[PDB]
Each structure stands twice: as C-alpha cells, then as structure tokens.
Amino acid sequence: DDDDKKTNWLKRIYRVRPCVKCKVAPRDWKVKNKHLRIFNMCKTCFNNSIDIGDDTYHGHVDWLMYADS
Amino acid sequence: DDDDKKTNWLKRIYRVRPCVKCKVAPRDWKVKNKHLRIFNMCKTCFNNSIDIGDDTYHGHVDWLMYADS
Ligand SMILES: Nc1ncnc2c1ncn2[C@@H]1O[C@H](COP(=O)(O)OP(=O)(O)OP(=O)(O)O)[C@@H](O)[C@H]1O
Ligand SMILES: Nc1ncnc2c1ncn2[C@@H]1O[C@H](COP(=O)(O)OP(=O)(O)OP(=O)(O)O)[C@@H](O)[C@H]1O
Ligand SMILES: [Cl-]
Ligand SMILES: [Zn+2]
Ligand SMILES: [Zn+2]
C-alpha cells in the first residue's frame, strides 16, 4: 500500500534527525490538514532561541502525508 | 536552508530504496510541477509487469519538492 510507504518514511524521517540545535530531543511538529510540518527545533530550544536572540535554526519542512496528490 | 533539507531527503529517499520488483534498478519518477512522483518500479520491470499480467507493484508516492506548502 502506497500511503504506508509515505507514513513509514515520515516516521523514519522524524525519528532519525533530532532537533538541529540540542541534537537529542526530537523536533516539534504539527498537522496542517494535508501536511505534516516538522519544525527544525524541539519546543524548548525554540523558545530558548528567542530568548537568546538567535534565529539561525528557525524554520520547518512540510511533508505531504499521503502517497497521492 | 529548509528547501535543501527537502531536496537532500528526496535525494536520499530516491537512492536508498530501488525498484520494489527487481530490487537493484532505481525507480522511475517524474515531476508534477509541484511534486516529485516516485513510481514503485523502474521502467523495465513496469512494462514487464504488464506483459506478465501482475499489477501487485503498480503505484507511486508523491513528494512535495519544497519545504513550505
Ligand atoms: N520549534 C521550532 N523550531 C524551529 N523553528 C520554528 C519552531 N516553531 C516555529 N518556528 C518558525 O517560526 C516562524 C513562525 O512559526 P509559526 O508556524 O507559528 O508561524 P505563524 O506566524 O505562527 O503561522 P502558523 O500559526 O500558520 O505557523 C516560522 O518560521 C516557523 O517555521
Ligand atoms: N514505473 C512504474 N512502476 C510502478 N507503477 C507504475 C509505474 N508507472 C506507472 N505506474 C502506475 O500505473 C498507473 C498509471 O500511470 P500514470 O502515472 O501514467 O497514470 P496515467 O493514467 O497515465 O495519468 P498520468 O499521466 O497523470 O500519470 C498509476 O497507478 C501509476 O502509479
Ligand atoms: Cl512529501
Ligand atoms: Zn532541541
Ligand atoms: Zn526493477
């Protein structure tokens, strides 16, 4: 089934690349109806980044949650 | 840069999982303006599958080519 290829990929993608900043915590994310948005940083490092005034790691990557457009 | 996260993922995804059928050849694919469609099989195994009358591996997974929707 093709949706499971997509899901297992998104599963893996999420697991194998942690927060770009603290490098252990998994990333923050959310659902945009159609897509899964994986934020670069976990939530703690994100808020922290704002307190320290560093926006280098701010951003996200959206993934279509289905196999078909 | 967030588009490069997407591109390098799509790069990897394409490289590490070959034709579901012959298991060595890389998959057939094409661009759908917005998305990259990775077909399950290379083109040779695909046409062959039709000649032998087996549609088990027919299908594709679409990937948004950008980091942002
Ligand atoms: N945990 C996080 N790690 C890295 N970057 C983040 C994180 N959370 C938010 N950002 C970035 O901060 C900016 C604002 O985030 P957010 O997604 O809240 O946008 P917004 O203006 O609130 O609109 P929306 O509510 O639709 O997202 C975007 O660049 C987002 O990618
Ligand atoms: N190389 C391939 N490996 C596995 N499945 C394939 C391959 N090529 C096509 N298919 C599948 O065969 C069906 C038809 O393919 P195709 O993408 O040509 O659809 P279509 O009806 O031609 O419309 P479009 O031209 O928009 O794709 C779809 O299920 C497609 O996923
Ligand atoms: Cl995607
Ligand atoms: Zn972190
Ligand atoms: Zn093949």
Domain ranges of chain A: 1-69
Place of tokens 């679409």: B62
> Technique behind this structure?
X-ray
Residue among B54, B48, B62 at smallest CA distance from B14: B62
Resolution attained, angstroms? 2.7
* Fold of domain B1-69: Nuclear Transport Factor 2; Chain: A, (3.10.450)
Distance CA B40, CA A6 (A): 12
Measured CA to CA, the distance from residue B27 to residue A17 in angstroms comes to 25
Q: Give SS3 for B9.
A: helix
Best residue in A37, A66, A68 for a mutation probing chain B (most B CBs within 10 Å) = A68
With beta carbons less than 8 A apart as the criterion, state whether B27 and B40 touch.
yes
Contacts of A19 (CB under 8 A, 6+ apart): A25, A26, A27, A40, A41, A42, A45
- Write out the two tokens for B62: 């679409």
Q: What is the amino acid identity at position A48?
A: N
Mutate to test the pocket of ligand 1, among A30, A38, A39 (most ligand atoms within 8 A of CB): A39
Which residues on adjacent β-strands are paired with residue B48? none
